[PDB]
């Protein structure tokens, strides 16, 4: 057995995957088999979700997280997010579940049967971690693959049916995107926006033309950078800046994945465009706004003058001003005045919420939507009791947004921890002190005392 | 070679679980306190003492089961099985909360038995008795909270019940009734506990990251041998690291390890003193100067004043069900509530 | 050498009494900015309208507080997650009214404390140490990010961040329990196990090492003079300590490897505090602790109360009373 015990490999059983650092064939098998696990879960979960899926309930009432992703891509849904065809969800699950067997077979093959290292079998497939030019070549292949993957989303949106547009005129509907936003002052303008409130960085993207046009820019950037990395070698400043080792490249990815995990947590929590509320439930801000609207509507129907009602503090009970003068809902939801949603935007004028439209133009579909969203706020217990912590058992509800945000915060955090673990270790291992201080040349004993 | 010396020989035999003379006290008392707790939480209700279900048999889970305290009407009765309340009836003894006093009293004598074990083993192997001395703190906590606190109060009913959520109720009771977070003795406790966990984390991490390379493996645990005379990690490097990061550092390993005894032990002792005060309702409930000012100036608001309102909510909303011997009927119009909620 | 090469050698110098480093060039201005502003705000800041309801809370010493009640009050609910630096205010008096100092302090603090973690990596690298003290520090760091940043983000306002004061901390805790049932959340419970266990293990390790100190001193002097700084010999008999503690419990319960023992002392409170931080940071998105309110029902359908039901009454009392003038509608949604 080659490198399969601690004495030969230097790593204990619980650090057992580190025995694969220089065994590229077994390491390839680890990765392909793990890719099979990911594809298996995507397949097995979708089929689980579909087997449980009641078509007459909203998706967010059903503890589904994958079916909403498919519905957002345009498959299976009609106007307002209602499900018209369960069969695309079945196909996505099945095809993932079958492809996981192929990835699983090739992972297991290279892990246990095939050559332990690839460097003798092939010069193209073998690699040294220290071979900087080979590393950029594999990086370049993978960038081209990811860039085509972004263009697939563009292909679906433009030439294969469209995407679910929650902002479409007349209600949410699957809409083909014909004019994506190509202009880089808009696309790269999102990158320069503040992440703070009212701004939201890239999380505030609020139309599918910007989403699609960004993915055009990303696909071409990734293909161009892919080609660039196949044709160049890391410049001198890059070679002096980085650690060039397998553990170091892993650490760099862990830093990147953690950052992406944190961004996804915010995307699912705040964005109702690529995470439509008809599939994922209302956002936290959306439900709080929906409550103020609901009681505005009820109280106005009873005869209340809503623009002139004082709350207990003296601020307007239903309506007040934001710190820049826009007319906004009152109460605690004053914090969420930057919320924008297709059920609320028809009440907004130039100065914010228009009081004449509020008096005259609230439709019954908005009243139903506000009540539905207020009663499906992303608040629930770990045993899936919906509502505040003080609520009784009855409602079985935790919003997908809560499940998705909490999970991805947890994952992003530990991946930050992993980045710090592996980045520190790769630094120490490259400098040669990862196993401890050498008793003969202890560095601190050669230093002058601090005092 | 009398019978005492032969019995001493047998009690101190090298075996898998050392017994000792302390084991005569410890082992039955610990087993009964442990077994009484599992028995009560599996099968015993709190319906007649608290009006609660508290067992797996009634549908509770691990978070909600408890062996609950006896009824307030029992006062501080020992509630012996043969006592005048149960009169030898085991079923009634369980219904009246006799398992609570059973666990508390056998837990108390077991804890004594455990500290006696610490002394006995330290004396036999020839080490100093600092582990027993450090165990005085959990004993001081147990005695103050489980015995002295209810003895100062009206009955054993107000002691903590032996259960996860029951303890959580005890925590929220102490906020709402005692304002225990405001108590400087509790604060000293918090500092000792959090300071203790900090020292645990930092000392462990410092040793692991200043290790000498004593072997070839990248997993470094194999490079230690318990018969080595040499330090396994560099105190000098650790000292230089911490002096440059934080300004100060340990330079004496003995003082370092004593300070690690001292910090959590002192904190727990300080909290115990606070709980003794709370036995007599001698709370640090309020700051008199702020109350005078808040009473006369309806615009003066602080985080302390806000907490007092929270405390008033806790008392009013919890007391009818938390103290069912009082027969509190608090009509809905007397309950303090803010606007809307 | 040019000026840049001389400056870089000064910055990364191991001979500086306090290590600067590249993280230090961020850490030092940020932490000084946060400290100075905190001290001035804690002493002298005027009352802050935390709840956005024109009901200012007095947090500073000059405005009637003592050490225990004083705080730097969180920024106004009307601001929400909006970035409120000094230049965004029309005057300092408006910045003060709206709780500007809080945003300035926590932002400089979190940036500074993140660089403290990096600086710990940096020095360990310069000294030839292993690099993972910083990983241990990531536990309290994550906890600080949880209460100052992540919780406000998920709740939609820096007004829900923990106040910078002692009673303000308690207010944050009580309201948190009211709204999230944190005591019934297993991540908090792991946090408690992390900190009680950490204090336990701190006491245990301290006591066992102290018990096994080898005699080098007389009765008239502190036994701590038995150790000399940088001596090569072990100052305690770990075989004696293992022989005690393995007879206190049983032999295989006790560490005989000091490296394993010290790893455990690292890993236990650190992993526990990570779970605590993730607890807060996941309750930021309102995934709350276990709700067993009315879980136990008799044959007729009568609710049979449990201890969780008693907790709920206490939770209700905090909930109905907290921010007593801020709510206009029946549900507390963020």
């Amino acid at each position: 057995a080659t490198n399969r015990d601690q004495e030969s490999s230097g790593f204990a059983w619980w650090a057992g995957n580190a025995r694969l650092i220089n065994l590229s064939g077994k390491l390839l098998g680890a990765h392909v088999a793990h890719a099979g696990l990911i594809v298996f879960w995507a397949g097995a979960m979708t089929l689980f979700e579909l087997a449980h899926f009641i078509p007459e309930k909203p998706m967010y009432e059903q503890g589904l997280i994958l079916i909403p992703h498919i519905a957002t891509l345009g498959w299976g849904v009609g106007p307002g997010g209602e499900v018209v065809d369960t069969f695309p969800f079945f196909v996505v699950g099945v095809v993932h579940l079958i492809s996981s067997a192929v990835l699983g077979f090739g992972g297991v093959y290279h892990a246990i049967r095939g050559p332990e290292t690839l460097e003798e079998y092939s010069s193209f497939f073998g690699y040294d971690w220290k071979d900087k030019n080979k590393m950029t070549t594999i990086l370049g292949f993978h960038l081209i693959v990811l860039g085509i993957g972004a263009l697939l989303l563009v292909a679906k949106a433009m030439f294969f049916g469209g995407l679910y547009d929650t902002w479409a005129p007349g209600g949410g509907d699957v809409r083909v995107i014909t004019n994506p936003t190509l202009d880089p002052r808009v696309i790269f303008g999102y990158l320069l926006k503040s992440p703070f409130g009212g701004e939201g960085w890239i999380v505030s993207v609020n139309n599918l033309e910007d989403v699609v046009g960004g993915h055009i820019w990303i696909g071409l950037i990734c293909i161009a950078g892919g080609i660039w990395h196949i044709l160049t070698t890391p410049f001198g400043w890059a070679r002096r800046a980085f650690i060039w080792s397998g553990e170091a490249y892993l650490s760099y990815s862990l830093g990147a994945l953690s950052m992406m995990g944190f961004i996804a947590t915010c995307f699912v929590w705040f964005n109702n465009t690529v995470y439509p509320s008809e599939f994922y439930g209302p956002t936290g801000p959306e439900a709080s706004q929906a409550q103020a609207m609901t009681f505005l509507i009820r109280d106005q129907k009873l005869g209340a003058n809503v623009g002139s009602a004082q709350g207990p503090t003296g601020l307007g009970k239903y309506l007040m001003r934001s710190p820049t003068g826009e007319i906004i809902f009152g109460g605690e939801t004053m914090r969420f005045w930057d919320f924008r949603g297709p059920w609320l935007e028809p009440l907004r004028g130039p100065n914010g919420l228009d009081l004449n439209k509020i008096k005259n133009d609230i439709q019954p579909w908005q009243e139903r939507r506000a009540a539905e969203y207020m009663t499906h706020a992303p608040l629930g217990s770990l045993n899936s009791v919906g509502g505040v912590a003080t609520e009784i058992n009855s409602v079985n509800f935790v919003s997908p947004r809560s499940w998705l945000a909490t999970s991805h915060f947890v994952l992003a955090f530990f991946f930050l921890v992993g980045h710090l673990w592996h980045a520190g270790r790769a630094r120490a291992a490259a400098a040669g002190f990862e196993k401890g201080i050498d008793r003969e040349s202890e560095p601190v004993l050669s230093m002058p005392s601090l005092d | 070679r009398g019978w005492f010396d032969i019995l001493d020989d047998w009690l101190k035999r090298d075996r898998f679980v050392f017994v000792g003379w302390s084991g005569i006290l410890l082992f039955p008392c610990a087993y009964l306190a442990l077994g009484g707790w599992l028995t009560g939480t599996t099968f015993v209700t709190s319906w007649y003492t608290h009006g609660l279900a508290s067992s797996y048999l009634e549908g509770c889970n691990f978070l909600t089961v408890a062996v609950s305290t006896p009824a307030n009407s029992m006062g501080h009765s020992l509630l012996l099985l043969w006592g005048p309340e149960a009169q030898g009836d085991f079923t009634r003894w369980c219904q009246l909360g006799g398992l609570w006093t059973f666990i508390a009293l056998h837990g108390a004598f077991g804890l004594i038995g455990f500290m006696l074990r610490q002394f006995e083993i330290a004396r036999l192997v020839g080490v100093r008795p600092y582990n027993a001395i450090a165990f005085s703190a959990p004993i001081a906590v147990f005695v103050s909270v489980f015995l002295i606190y209810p003895l100062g109060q009206s009955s054993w009913f107000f002691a903590p019940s032996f259960g996860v959520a029951a303890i959580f109720r005890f925590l929220l009771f102490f906020q709402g009734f005692h304002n225990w977070t405001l108590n400087p003795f509790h604060m000293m406790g918090v500092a000792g506990v959090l300071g203790g966990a900090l020292l645990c984390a930092i000392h462990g991490a410092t040793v692991e990251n200043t290790l000498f390379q004593d072997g070839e493996g990248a997993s470094t645990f194999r490079a230690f041998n318990p018969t080595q005379a040499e330090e396994t990690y560099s105190m000098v490097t650790a000292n230089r690291f911490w002096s440059q990061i934080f300004g100060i550092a340990f330079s004496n390993k003995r003082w370092l390890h004593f300070f690690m005894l001292f910090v959590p032990v002192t904190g727990l002792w300080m909290s115990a003193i606070g709980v003794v005060g709370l036995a007599l309702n001698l709370r640090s409930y309020d700051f008199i100067s702020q109350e005078i000012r808040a009473a006369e100036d309806p615009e003066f608001e602080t985080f302390y004043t806000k907490n007092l309102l929270l405390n008033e909510g806790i008392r009013a909303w919890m007391a009818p069900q938390d103290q069912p011997h009082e027969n509190f009927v608090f009509p809905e119009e007397v309950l303090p509530r803010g606007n809307a909620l | 050498a040019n000026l840049w090469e001389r400056f870089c050698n000064w910055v990364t110098s191991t001979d500086n009494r306090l290590y600067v480093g590249w993280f230090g060039v961020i850490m030092i201005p940020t932490l000084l900015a946060a400290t100075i502003c905190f001290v001035i705000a804690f002493i002298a800041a005027p009352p802050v309208d935390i709840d956005g309801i024109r009901e200012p809370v007095s947090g500073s010493l000059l405005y009637g507080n003592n050490i225990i009640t004083g705080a730097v009050v969180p920024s106004s609910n009307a601001i929400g997650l909006h970035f409120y630096p000094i230049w965004e205010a029309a005057s300092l008096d408006e910045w003060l009214y709206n709780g500007g100092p809080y945003q300035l302090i926590i932002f400089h603090f979190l940036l500074g404390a993140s660089c403290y973690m990096g600086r710990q990596w940096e020095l360990s690298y310069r000294l030839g140490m292993r690099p993972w003290i910083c990983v241990a520090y990531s536990a309290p760091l994550a906890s600080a990010f949880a209460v100052f940043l992540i919780y406000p983000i998920g709740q939609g306002s820096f007004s829900d961040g923990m106040p910078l004061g002692i009673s303000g901390t308690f207010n944050f805790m009580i309201v948190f329990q009211a709204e999230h049932n944190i005591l019934m959340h297993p991540f908090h419970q792991l946090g408690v196990a992390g900190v009680f266990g950490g204090a336990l293990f701190c006491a245990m390790h301290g006591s066992l090492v102290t018990s096994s100190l080898i005699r080098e001193t007389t009765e008239t002097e502190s036994a701590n003079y038995g150790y000399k700084f940088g001596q090569e010999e072990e100052t305690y008999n770990i075989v004696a300590a293992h022989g005690y503690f393995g007879r206190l419990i049983f032999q295989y319960a006790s560490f005989n490897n000091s490296r394993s023992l010290h790893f455990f002392l690292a890993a236990w409170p650190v992993v526990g505090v990570w779970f605590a931080a993730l607890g807060i940071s996941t309750m930021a998105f309102n995934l709350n602790g276990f709700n067993f309110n009315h879980s136990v029902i008799d044959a007729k359908g009568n609710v049979i109360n449990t201890w969780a039901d008693i907790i709920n009454r206490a939770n209700l009392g905090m909930e109905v009373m907290h921010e007593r003038n801020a709510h206009n509608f029946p549900l507390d949604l963020a």
Partner: peptide, 30 residues
């Protein structure tokens, strides 16, 4: 008086930090 007392004790603590860092007994290797 209260405010002065709290600030005074605080200022002494900061001073004690200064002496504990810059005027410690120097760790000497022996």
């Amino acid at each position: 008086m209260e405010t002065i007392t709290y600030v005074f004790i605080f200022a002494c603590i900061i001073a004690l930090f200064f002496f504990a860092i810059f005027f410690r007994e120097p760790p000497r290797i022996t």
